[PDB]
Amino acid sequence: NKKEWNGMMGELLSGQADMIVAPLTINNERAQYIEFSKPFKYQGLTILVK
Amino acid sequence: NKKEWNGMMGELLSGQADMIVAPLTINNERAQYIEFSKPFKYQGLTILVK
Amino acid sequence: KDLSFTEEGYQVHPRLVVIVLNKDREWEKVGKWENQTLSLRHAVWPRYKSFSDCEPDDNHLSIVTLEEAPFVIVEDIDPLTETCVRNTVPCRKFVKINNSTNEGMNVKKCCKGFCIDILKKLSRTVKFTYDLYLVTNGKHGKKVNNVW
Amino acid sequence: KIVNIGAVLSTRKHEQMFREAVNQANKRHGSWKIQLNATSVTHKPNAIQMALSVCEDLISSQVYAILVSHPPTPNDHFTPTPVSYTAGFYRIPVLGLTTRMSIYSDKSIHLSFLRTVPPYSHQSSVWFEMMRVYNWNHIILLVSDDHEGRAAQKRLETLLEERESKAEKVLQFDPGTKNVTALLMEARELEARVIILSASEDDAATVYRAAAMLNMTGSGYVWLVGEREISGNALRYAPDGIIGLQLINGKNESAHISDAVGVVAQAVHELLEKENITDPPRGCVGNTNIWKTGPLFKRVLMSSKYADGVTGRVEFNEDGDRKFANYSIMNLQNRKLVQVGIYNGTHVIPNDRKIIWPGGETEKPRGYQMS
Amino acid sequence: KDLSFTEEGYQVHPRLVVIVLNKDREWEKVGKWENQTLSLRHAVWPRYKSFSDCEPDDNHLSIVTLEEAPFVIVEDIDPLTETCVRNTVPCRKFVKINNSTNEGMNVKKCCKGFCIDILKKLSRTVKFTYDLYLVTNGKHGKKVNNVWNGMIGEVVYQRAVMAVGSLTINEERSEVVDFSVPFVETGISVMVS
Amino acid sequence: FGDDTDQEAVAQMLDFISSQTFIPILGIHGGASMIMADKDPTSTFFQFGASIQQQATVMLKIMQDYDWHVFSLVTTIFPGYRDFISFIKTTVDNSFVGWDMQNVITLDTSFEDAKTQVQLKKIHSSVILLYCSKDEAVLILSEARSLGLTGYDFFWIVPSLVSGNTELIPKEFPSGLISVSYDDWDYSLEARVRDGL
Amino acid sequence: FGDDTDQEAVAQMLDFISSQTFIPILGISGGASMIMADKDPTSTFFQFGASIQQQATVMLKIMQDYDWHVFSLVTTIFPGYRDFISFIKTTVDNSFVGWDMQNVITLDTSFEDAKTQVQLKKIHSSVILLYCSKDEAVLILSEARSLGLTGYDFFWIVPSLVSGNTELIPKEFPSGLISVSYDDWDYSLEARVRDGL
Amino acid sequence: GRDEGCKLVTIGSGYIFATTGYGIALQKGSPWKRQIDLALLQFVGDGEM
Amino acid sequence: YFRRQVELSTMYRHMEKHNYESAAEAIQAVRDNKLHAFIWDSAVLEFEA
Amino acid sequence: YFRRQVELSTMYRHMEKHNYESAAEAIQAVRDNKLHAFIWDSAVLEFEA
């Protein structure tokens, strides 16, 4: 009954990774555990259709 | 430095009348001082233009 | 001196004195009350940070800002009531009295806007007091002769 | 090692009954070495020297409770007030015995004036019981005076808070005038015929004399007053058939004082449980050393919960007065006070007597003009 | 029975018993523990307000409602967290095994919608506590030989203190109980294509 | 006469003197100047002081000028409090400010710290108005110090009957306690008796 | 080995027997199965009971099933408290609830009711977890009733460290105390030892 | 409103209908009636409804 | 209703220089285009429509 | 972001059906109209447009 992280964050916190130079979306909870730099890209959310 | 009632409510609370049968706008402060019945008309506010 | 007496024996125009307790256990004469008006020496409220022994205070946060209309709207207080309407926040502005001297006063005004709402919601969440006033030297700031 | 108890009293029989209560208090209250001494001061014609004799004879005696039991004074002001202020100088509870006025029952002017007789505000409780039982809701408040009248109207609003009702008309004014007829005739032309009246004795006589001028002796009238309004010339001027109130054992003096002193002595033995013995010092010579258990022993006056008494179940409420007092309900059957009801607790028990009303039938007059 | 052990030597699935102290001043077995989960005999949690003799007060309110899709959305518990989400409030439903049996259990569920926010803002302002529960008797109310069904019967027989949920008002309902001031214009309506 | 101690009932004694000697008597200082409830109609006693209503007006003017709006109201059963609460309620009724008021926290007796403690823990606001006697004020402020209700955001504005003599400042008072009185040391007693004469 | 008394160290004595005789030993109930902290690889001893971590897991499951999301942790200086606090903090860090958790308030010595009073007045929440011995739990509950922290809205959940004998229930225990213990009377002693065999 | 495609259409806009209103059901003589009524009419007077 | 809602304070600045005593005077003024909007209940306005 | 907001909970119980590993598989699934819409950032979808 234990919380963990996976993916790039799961490899970051486990010491397998030390810097994520990748399109990571900054939100609240991911900033609650690790530190974030200032964002290099500003955008939002939208919907793709045909 | 005293607030009193005027108009139809100032005439009612002075004892000049016995019951208001009129288009009375039901709101908070009128219910704080006098009793109510159930409303016979149900509508809100809007804007008249030309 | 209008030393008239009421029907229940009270001075109509007495001399009220409003006092605070200093750090050295004395009552300091601060505010005299007039006929109708209230003469207050301290427009800015003095903090008196150590009300007792065990008081570390880290929440009287001094905040300065600039009049920029889409985020900061600074308006006069209503002279009929002398009360900022509750969607706004209080503020003060250092206004110079004369051109000859650098002495001025602190006129209290009202502030609304977007960053004002941000500050109010920070006070909702982080639960800290805030001391809001305005800047008079420069608007944004620029390093001039290595002086910010 | 002793407890001195002082009082303001004249008669030798009640002093003997006081010493008899002193003797009875040392019987069943344990084997502790506490003793009791009696001091009672008598009449003086000058009212300042009354409290002067009280202060120099009881502060030097270090008394713990002060009781005044003087109805028959020719001065109708009824002022033990400087004695109560002298007891309030070191926060001593003044145990009243006679008066019931709201200006004396007020906790503001009289900080520690508690008693086992209910004030005139609890006549509104009897009036509220009459409105509950006999299903009456159209009332008019008429108080000629203003000292007790504001507290009486406050108590009336407090008791009408439960029904969430309001009086149709309230009248407070200056007595002594004869032309009060305009407000009374306009209250006649209203739709309330249950009229509530409570004032001074001569003021009751004045408004009863004004009731004869205005044809207020007809039918539909519901009158119910206190005990002051049915005595003196107000008794002669009242319309016959009027319903009145009376305190059971009200003018009873020996057993009332005996039960009060029993409450005093057993309250002292309650205070001896949790020790904290504080004593009012001799304030007559330059002393302002205040008595620490002033409110706390007043707490003993607030928590004096008993059930033994000739008057009845003596117990102090949040107002410091008698809980659920014993009442008689009288009828003035043709200038004759006829008892037409008793009262226990919160309930009126009407007896098997006849209730003749000042108007029509013998049952309840529900003279309501139905709007 | 899997009474297995760990490296710390404790039992993997031991036998846990959750007892209380009732008003009878003795221990009473209430909660039992399964192999992984908890089971409660009293899923309805009462006050147990008489801790001692000095408690005259009253702030809880027994409140019944009824399922209406634009007003009272009733959902299951969230299986990800085993917790109602923050706008939803807990409730219960008296669900039986089938129609032939007569005994049922009060399964805890979640509620949101229109009247839920009304009740929460009332509990903000009037400053009381509340116990939300549905009704399994049926619809709003219908007099069946001087017996009301659903919510109205629970108010008349006083097992429900108040019905804050969505409820139509007509003459006989205004006769048998008392209502509040209105808050939404809800007459009748006819639907076609 | 002006008293030096903190016994208001002395003036009440003087009030009875004003009911009996028919002499206009001026209460000047200390317990002789403390405000009682209702002066008698036969009395000619007059005090050099303000009303409780004017002093409440001054305190609410302070709260309006310094923008402290969300407050509470705590009184004991020391009387004169019902009219004080009524004046505060009518002031809220006569307010263009839009004041916020936590409900009245009363006290049953001299506190056992059993039932009044839960009543005090209902408060989590900034400014509290306290109205009781001076020793009871010391006890309630010691309780609030034990409850931690004497912090930086926790202000206390008290009337003159709480303050009393300016020559005596007792213990358990926060360095920053806000009081409103009229015992001005600059406004001399000689000027008081000269204006009275 | 089974037991019906409250002498836990006998089982620890069996643990010493388990340190020397190299024999697997089972403890049924009473003092034979009261929880010791850390076993030994030199030992083969076992109890029939639930650890304080698993009991804390059950208690947090109970607190989760009523949505009582706000609590305060109160322990004495009785040992095992550090592992208790650390397990509760690691469980809250692995919890989907988002517990609005008031901090942990402990004691230091035998209480003068002077500083411990200030420590207990910090709680204005409802649910309180209490881990302490039975000799001091009566003192804590009597002080909380004396401070009004045993109110109708408040709650108290304790482990089996206080809830021992069924008969010994003093007056200070509030009617509404929830405890957790592995004394299942639905399972007999013979069924337990048959399961052990 | 949740009709997928605006297919099912209502009749009128509240003209020829019964015109009643939802309320809050309380027991007869309950003391909470006036307080709930004042709280609801306060909740109307800010646009929160 | 607009004085309680503080976010509607700005319109509260306007009508204090512009309000009338009867709605018939408002209908007569908006007929001559002296008004440009009129916050009012729907029954009277739809009847005049 | 859609698990937090309480007014988007129902869609969160629908979008948990077809959770995809990569965005390329999302482009492939909308490419044959196996989907009907997709939630993604701005500049990535502008580049794909």
Ligand SMILES: *[C@@H]1O[C@H](CO)[C@@H](O[C@@H]2O[C@H](CO)[C@@H](O)[C@H](O)[C@H]2NC(C)=O)[C@H](O)[C@H]1NC(C)=O
């Ligand atoms: C108080 O009232 C009682 C009656 O309730 C009276 O006591 C009577 O006292 C006389 C002696 O003076 C006895 O002979 C009677 O037996 C008592 N009354 C009865 C009926 O028992 C008296 O009016 C009051 N108390 C006193 C003694 O004055």
Ligand SMILES: *[C@@H]1O[C@H](CO)[C@@H](O[C@@H]2O[C@H](CO)[C@@H](O)[C@H](O)[C@H]2NC(C)=O)[C@H](O)[C@H]1NC(C)=O
């Ligand atoms: C222990 O009880 C649980 C039910 O609470 C059972 O666990 C089942 O196991 C599957 C395995 O994938 C899980 O998906 C579920 O948690 C359970 N099944 C259900 C209800 O979907 C388990 O069977 C029990 N142990 C034994 C031995 O029966």
Ligand SMILES: *[C@@H]1O[C@H](CO)[C@@H](O)[C@H](O)[C@H]1NC(C)=O
């Ligand atoms: C009050 O006093 C000030 C200063 O003496 C004076 O300027 C002002 O006109 C006075 N206000 C009144 C009540 O007229």
Ligand SMILES: *[C@@H]1O[C@H](CO)[C@@H](O)[C@H](O)[C@H]1NC(C)=O
């Ligand atoms: C300085 O004060 C004088 C006073 O008369 C005034 O005339 C002058 O305008 C002031 N200076 C400025 C620039 O405001």
Ligand SMILES: *[C@@H]1O[C@H](CO)[C@@H](O)[C@H](O)[C@H]1NC(C)=O
């Ligand atoms: C007065 O103010 C003006 C700007 O309005 C400035 O140019 C001038 O320097 C000031 N007066 C002095 C100090 O000469």
Ligand SMILES: *[C@@H]1O[C@H](CO)[C@@H](O)[C@H](O)[C@H]1NC(C)=O
């Ligand atoms: C006791 O009472 C008597 C009579 O009232 C009095 O003379 C005496 O002074 C009192 N005090 C003593 C000495 O106990």
Ligand SMILES: *[C@@H]1O[C@H](CO)[C@@H](O)[C@H](O)[C@H]1NC(C)=O
């Ligand atoms: C006023 O009182 C006098 C004396 O009773 C009486 O003669 C007179 O008629 C009264 N006036 C009115 C208004 O009836």
Ligand SMILES: *[C@@H]1O[C@H](CO)[C@@H](O)[C@H](O)[C@H]1NC(C)=O
């Ligand atoms: C009272 O009644 C008598 C007899 O009917 C009548 O003469 C008198 O005018 C009445 N008084 C008034 C004014 O009601």
Ligand SMILES: *[C@@H]1O[C@H](CO)[C@@H](O)[C@H](O)[C@H]1NC(C)=O
């Ligand atoms: C007596 O009262 C004092 C405070 O005045 C208090 O310190 C003491 O504990 C009390 N004694 C007892 C417990 O009876």
Ligand SMILES: *[C@@H]1O[C@H](CO)[C@@H](O)[C@H](O)[C@H]1NC(C)=O
């Ligand atoms: C009041 O009423 C009863 C009625 O019999 C009477 O005997 C007694 O004196 C009183 N008892 C109480 C309850 O006070």
Ligand SMILES: *[C@@H]1O[C@H](CO)[C@@H](O)[C@H](O)[C@H]1NC(C)=O
């Ligand atoms: C009056 O007497 C009855 C006994 O007949 C008793 O229960 C109570 O004290 C009184 N009635 C009530 C309920 O007030």
Ligand SMILES: *[C@@H]1O[C@H](CO)[C@@H](O)[C@H](O)[C@H]1NC(C)=O
């Ligand atoms: C009761 O009958 C209903 C009819 O729809 C059925 O759906 C249900 O399964 C039955 N009872 C239960 C709760 O199983």
Ligand SMILES: *[C@@H]1O[C@H](CO)[C@@H](O)[C@H](O)[C@H]1NC(C)=O
């Ligand atoms: C209950 O009813 C269902 C059908 O609704 C049926 O399949 C089932 O066997 C019944 N009993 C049980 C075992 O749930």
